Amino acid sequence: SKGEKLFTGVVPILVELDGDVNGHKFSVSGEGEGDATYGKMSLKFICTTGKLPVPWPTLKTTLMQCFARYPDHMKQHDFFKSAMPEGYVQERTIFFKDDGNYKTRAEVKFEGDTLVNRIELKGVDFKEDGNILGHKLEYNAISGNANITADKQKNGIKAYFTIRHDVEDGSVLLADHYQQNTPIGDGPVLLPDNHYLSTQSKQSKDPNEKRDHMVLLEFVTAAGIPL
């Protein structure tokens, strides 16, 4: 594969999410730019249906690991770019401790020069008086590691990690992520040695934006193999 050559410059990003959580339906759209040379994504997401019925932080991991910076010595472990431009399917289950779960399915692919992330999200067994449907989570930055492993049987990768969401009562809401990625195309892909993606995030608002929205500046770096 020569998928990595598609990311050497600034790439426009389009995101589309259709969600249903305990029957509360919503849509999100997002745009921005990825600059994988520096591991960077600059993004803005809008709830297109009015008020988001779950907190923005709970959707962040769902709303493009193809934009990670793999250091030169780790290039042979970058499944995400190797699958381009045909793309990959990303599936997760996210278990919120003592609350419901999200089941997600996404297709991440190029549509001409645009990297498009099209997502379906289904959430069930949430508590209406809980920290999620009750909107009791802090609007702050999520940072941390995604652990990546080869899935030889599916010619893809699996990932796992736990996000710690701050609750406005000073407690923490744990969100256990289980991830599977499979190439959409039939061509060759890179199957990695074990490693992780480290994300640094800055979360903000646009003071001119009336719509329910999220602004992110993300930097994502591959790590866990020396040299």
Numbering used by the authors: 2 to 64, 68 to 231
What does the paper say about this structure?
Recently, a fluorescent protein based on an anionic tryptophan (Trp) was developed and was named WasCFP.
For the comparative study of the two crystal forms, we chose the orthorhombic crystal structure obtained at pH 9.0 for comparison with the monoclinic structure since it has a higher resolution (1.7 Å). Two of them come from the arginine–aspartic acid salt bridge between Asp180 of Orth(A) and Arg168 of Orth(B). In the case of the Orth(A) and Mono structures, the key residue Lys61 has ∼80% k1 conformation and ∼20% k2 conformation under a high-pH condition (pH 9.0).
